[PDB]
């Protein structure tokens, strides 16, 4: 075949009912998920790729960067309740990765204040029971997939992107077989 299980993909030998239909997983100290967003722009090509009515979740993880790693899954909540995602994720992969201005959860902080969220607004979500749920669905997601590594992606909790076997001589060709891998496993 064209697409074969262990190739471009592998399937969970344990799928996870009721799972988001494009599921996603990234932290801010990730090298590759940092190229991810920044370089390739995968999630974004992902959905122009997408059928109508599908959606796309993409979830933070706590395994990397210990105490500042938790904090950013907190912050991650916090951007998705607020929907400001699209204004946070550039400054946050530099800040951890780049300029490393990033230690703490207030350096976090900044980046939402500079970003033009409101200090009280930030801190009210921060500490409010709709982002602790939303954590709670970001780390239930990962547990629910026996997640160790990312960047990783997941379509309808039974088929897991496999980027390794994809040729990376070219860095669009390997945005579009990616895309179209998606696609692909969407329709399945």
Same mark, same amino acid.
């Given at each position: 075949?064209?697409?074969?299980?262990?190739?471009?993909?592998?399937? !969970? #030998?344990?799928?996870?009912?009721?799972?988001? /239909?494009?599921?996603?997983?990234?932290? *801010? *100290?990730?090298? =590759?998920?940092?190229?991810?967003?920044? &370089?390739? =722009?995968? +999630?974004?090509?992902?959905?122009?790729?997408?059928?109508?009515? @599908?959606?796309?979740?993409?979830? =933070?993880?706590?395994?990397?960067?210990? $105490?500042?790693?938790?904090?950013?899954?907190?912050?991650?909540?916090?951007?998705?309740?607020?929907?400001?995602?699209?204004?946070?994720? &550039?400054?946050?992969? #530099?800040? @951890?990765?780049?300029? /490393?201005?990033?230690?703490?959860?207030? %350096?976090?902080? $900044?980046?939402?204040?500079?970003?033009?969220?409101?200090?009280?607004?930030? %801190?009210?979500?921060?500490? +409010?029971? @709709? &982002?602790?749920? !939303?954590?709670?669905? /970001?780390?239930?997601?990962?547990?629910?997939?026996?997640?160790?590594?990312?960047?990783?992606?997941?379509?309808?909790?039974?088929? /897991?992107?496999?980027?390794?076997?994809?040729?990376?001589?070219?860095?669009?060709? *390997?945005?579009?077989?990616?895309?179209?891998? &998606?696609?692909?496993? +969407? #329709?399945?």
């Amino acid at each position: 075949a064209q697409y074969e299980d262990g190739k471009q993909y592998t399937t !969970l #030998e344990k799928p996870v009912a009721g799972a988001p /239909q494009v599921l996603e997983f990234f932290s *801010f *100290f990730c090298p =590759h998920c940092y190229q991810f967003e920044e &370089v390739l =722009h995968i +999630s974004d090509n992902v959905k122009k790729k997408l059928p109508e009515g @599908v959606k796309m979740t993409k979830y =933070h993880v706590n395994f990397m960067g210990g $105490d500042l790693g938790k904090d950013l899954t907190q912050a991650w909540a916090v951007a998705m309740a607020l929907g400001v995602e699209d204004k946070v994720t &550039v400054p946050l992969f #530099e800040g @951890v990765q780049k300029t /490393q201005t990033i230690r703490s959860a207030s %350096d976090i902080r $900044d980046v939402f204040i500079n970003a033009g969220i409101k200090g009280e607004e930030y %801190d009210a979500a921060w500490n +409010s029971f @709709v &982002v602790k749920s !939303l954590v709670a669905q /970001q780390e239930k997601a990962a547990a629910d997939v026996q997640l160790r590594g990312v960047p990783a992606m997941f379509v309808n909790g039974k088929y /897991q992107l496999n980027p390794q076997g994809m040729d990376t001589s070219n860095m669009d060709v *390997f945005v579009q077989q990616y895309a179209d891998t &998606v696609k692909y496993l +969407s #329709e399945k």
